[PDB]
Symmetry: C4
């Protein structure tokens, strides 16, 4: 039958470049004839032959009559959808997978696993589907909005790992990792370390033995919670990223948080999901990240890379590697993913560029993709091109 997928060394390259923009709302004018779905929280996951562009829709299209409520996060209509990457996610092109206001998905070499969360805020539910079949669920353990990544989960040898968390957006949210095999939870991993708040982890394989995640702390710091998960022992430990280049929004000025690596610092309340992807080379490991250009608003998006070291102990600034979205453009969630070439994996970061005109109108997003490509430096930025008044 198909072989189980494993992380492979990354394809040769030393800079990211602009790849593709899926800007569905370039076709949503009242005088046009299209039906782009109103979405937020897009992410991409690839199998050996194809990538799927996922998102949580509000089950409404532009132009339409259901714009009121599209700036709300959770409700009974939101669903996990996808199209093949490169197709415009319209009413007719998309697949509705399950009811969900928080999702994830990944391919293990043989089939797709889709994860969706819905239920009341105080008692929500992780629902897992493997192909066509709904296969398992997991219960709220802290009864305050159980939720997951909003990016791809990660499979090795048929075991797919997924961060879930539950708890207050203003207090404690201790995340946990599920090991899912063929749609069924075969292990629950309870992390050790700086565990007071970890959510919206962007995860990937550092090697066949370790998964790493750059996460969001919505209450205490602008440094990202950084997870190291040993896949063989099924143990995880979390400590804050020590780099002075704080990747969350809001954040203080770089290098202004004094004291040891663990110090929380100022402007900790609030957050944003951030891009992170690995370049696995025979000798070294590159960790690529993205953060907004604004320190306080979801505007702009810049690339950073650091080779080797320990993200937990190194205060050194990450190397600035290009402006993907200028400060004039919206820069909201970003996520890492990998495209499978014939013999190696191509690391990419995707960026959600939300069209926000507030609650009085529709609310949705475009997705920009940057990927490792050749050498030199990043050459061009992405604009969505949408005028929200049309």
């Amino acid at each position: 039958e198909p072989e189980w997928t494993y992380p492979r060394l990354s394809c040769q390259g030393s800079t990211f470049q602009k790849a593709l923009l899926i800007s569905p709302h370039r076709f949503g004018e009242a005088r046009g004839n299209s039906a782009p779905l109103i979405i937020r929280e897009p992410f991409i996951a690839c199998g050996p032959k194809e990538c799927k562009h996922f998102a949580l829709t509000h089950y409404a299209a532009q132009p339409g009559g259901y714009y009121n409520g599209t700036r709300e996060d959770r409700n009974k209509l939101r669903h996990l959808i996808s199209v093949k990457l490169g197709k415009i996610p319209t009413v007719e092109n998309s697949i509705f997978h399950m009811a969900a206001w928080s999702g994830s998905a990944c391919h293990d070499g043989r089939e797709w696993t889709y994860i969706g969360v819905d239920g009341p805020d105080s008692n929500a539910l992780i629902k897992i589907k493997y192909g066509e079949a709904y296969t398992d669920t997991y219960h709220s353990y802290a009864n305050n909005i159980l939720r997951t990544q909003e990016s791809a989960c990660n499979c090795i040898g048929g075991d797919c790992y997924l961060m879930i968390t539950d708890g207050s957006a203003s207090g404690i949210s201790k995340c946990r990792f599920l090991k899912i095999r063929e749609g069924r939870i075969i292990k629950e991993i309870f992390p050790t370390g700086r565990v007071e708040h970890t959510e919206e982890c962007t995860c990937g394989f550092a090697s066949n033995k370790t998964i790493e995640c750059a996460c969001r702390d919505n209450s205490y710091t602008a440094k990202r919670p950084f997870v190291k998960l040993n896949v063989e022992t099924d143990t995880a430990e979390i400590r804050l990223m020590c780099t002075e280049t704080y990747l969350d929004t809001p954040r203080p000025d770089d290098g202004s948080i004094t004291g040891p690596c663990e110090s929380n610092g100022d402007k900790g309340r609030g957050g944003i999901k951030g891009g992170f992807v690995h370049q696995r080379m025979a000798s070294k490991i590159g960790r690529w990240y993205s953060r907004t250009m604004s320190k306080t608003e979801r505007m702009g998006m810049e690339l950073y890379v650091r080779y080797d070291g320990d993200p937990w102990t190194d205060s050194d600034a990450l190397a600035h590697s290009g402006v993907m979205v200028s400060m004039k453009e919206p820069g909201w969630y970003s996520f890492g993913f990998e495209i499978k070439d014939k013999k190696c994996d191509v690391p990419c970061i995707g960026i959600e560029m939300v069209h926000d005109g507030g609650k009085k109108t529709w609310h949705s997003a475009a997705t920009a993709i940057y990927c490792l490509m050749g050498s030199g430096q990043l050459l061009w930025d992405t604009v969505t091109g949408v005028d929200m008044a049309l």
Copy 2:
């Protein structure tokens, strides 16, 4: 060739949970750019690899100009259509299988069999199609609207069984079962027992030897005719469900039908097609059923279960297992179906949620899907989200 499908034991689990909502008319606004088909009597049937969401279209879209007639049942334009479960049944996404104002379909492991009925009321006709080929028909035997299930037929080792019935909607309608192999009827099975009115059976496998059906009596009782068809002998017997939880609409209060199990009781005229699906375990069988929350109108929908016992003699209440559709929301036909996971079958119930705004405007439906998924209790209900004035 691929091999014939057989019922297997159900995937482990102990509660249903909200799975998927296909609400096409969320995109049918006059200022939108979509063409959801006007449909009624939706149902789902799955093969080894995919599920198809079938329905009986009025061959008209919303927005459109052919709303006069969409509250009629039978007319020369009605057709059986489908999309892969998860696609929006729109004009371009659907496949039109045959002219039909009554339908069923199922997969035997190798190919799909589609059943449609059309023709004048006095002389209607069952038409069978295997794949692309029209293979056989069956004539009206009581000359009064020959009709069928409006839910999946059931195949075992290549033999697919189908309830057909014929006769007065407020009188006698003695059903019969067709045994169809590769699109040709190879046997007629004439049931025994309480046979005066059985229609719209929701059937499935209780094991490899027995198919059971929960049906509608539109004339005499609010209790459901319960069919047990022995697949090895190709014989069937029907008796009324004895449970005090009357599953039909309209119905009297639970437990008010005094006297022996077969007593018809009060508020017998009228009916609704009802959900029913089996959870086969090694030494226990679960029978899951759905009924409206209103005793008289097609509003709401609640889940019920009972493990083991004989439906024909057990007067005990069914155990209530969640509100799938609130009293506020439409709850029309419901049906059972199973999804094929790798080693086991997943029981589900789907719910037709009709948008009823009277004869004065368009008429159509959403489909809500609930499936056995994990443990605990059912967490959330479904709303269609459609404002019929847009």
Copy 3:
């Protein structure tokens, strides 16, 4: 590689029944959101796994701004298109195959052959495509609108046969048959007999040795030219159908043409393409035909069958076998085709139901399908359901 296709015995059955209606313009209202293509001359051809519904479009959709000219037969924009049978032929669902104002197509077991005719009226061109590749052409031999069937060609052992004709619509048009193998003309067959005018032949296999065609004579008779083509010798002879049930429109009353089988009779000028398909049984051959209900206008469509005999010498009336389209509905071109079941072929007749409001508005058609199905008699008729004012 795939086996070459051959005619097989027909599936068991003794009556045709209503199968499917593709009425695209049920979705073309000015207030709707669809784009049905404006077409005429539809036909269907099936391979082992799928049928394709072909037609000549005017390269215009309803609603639209290019209605003027859609009642003209030939122009530089017309093209042969198709969708999979059961899909609505819209702008996006259809495939444009080649420029063509006269077409044909058939599958030989391995690939599809598409034939299209365009060029000036005095010097047009047969163009043949095999899969993606344009492979051959044939030249006008009488320099007066070279044209072909407007129905499926017929392949046996990899040789596909096709009627083409050229000459005056009011005078002599001596048809010829091409034997095409893998897109290339390997033989030209010059018919013998009553050859003064044969066009728009509907052809099919009577056996592995003989192809037969019921054709149109636009100038001299209302009896159809009937072709018998021996596939082994590659010779064809044509004589008029002798049945008193004249299948052309216009036509005199049945049985009013006195004299021998060859007599032309009255009301010979004008014509219509007619349905014809074979039911090949081990012992006997049924020839199924269709003609309009009106003797003079393209209104209504009735089925007729005759078993055995010689169509050239038998004056006997064909057996009336059902009203497919009533006299209130449009009945224009009709064609035969066969659907491949697992072990046998299912004969069908398709009917073009044109929406004609004259030259001041759009002009297009619906396609109704009737197929051999069970026993008894034909039970229901087809209406397109379209109101040309919406």
Copy 4:
């Protein structure tokens, strides 16, 4: 695996004929319900099984609200897109391959390679994608709009060759050829000879050892730079076509450029990309070319051929072989491509037919296709049928 593609001898034939017209804006009326994409620089490339129709979209549809900018060449929204040849390149039918304002693509027998260029004018970048994976890039070497073919690249035994160029549009632009294998550049080939300005090469195989290109000189001459690239040594040489039939637009009258073959002549500034395709026979090679009917404007398009000889020294007129687009109709870029029949290759030329209504309104194009087909002479021209005011 499948094997590598090699040029083969061409299918037998001696004239081109009108094959297919893809006119998307026949469906772009404000009162219609379609979304044809606004595109320019279309081209076609075929693999063993299918052809893809590529183009450079402005990421806007007709009707729509983003027409300001559609007469620009380079901007951050331009993307390489495709549909299977014969599908209408609409918003939902197309696949968006990468951000690109200059492109090429071709199939090597196993997979597709897509090439896009974007980035600032002074520092643009070639991006290569093999299948789904972004595999390599190539930097600007003259810092003045690095660009490529806008027609198919060409693969032999897995090596795909591509013309890239860089430099002033009214000065020096010395092209280079990239040899790409499975999406990675394995060699740069620096041409020899008349090298001062070569761009938008239309390339193809003259045999298994030589690729030839007919290119555009936008600065100095109306004669086309003619490249002969030896595939075995990976060396190229460029000299101007000596034919008195100048293939560029603008151009002086045929034969007015006096002096030796390499004389630049008059009306050299400005240009157009031009069609060119080979007809390989056992002992003769046919070179087919297209040019506008107007000597100064992009109006009309005529076919020309010459068999054998050396394009670099033969001053003889090319033989005129038909009007494909009349003086009345737009004739913009043209390109060559080959379709793969079972045993041989079919030469074709496609023509971009731009709808030009000025800067004041939308701008886009149809594509007309002519292919070698049978014998005789070319019979009919192509019109787009689009009224730009609708």
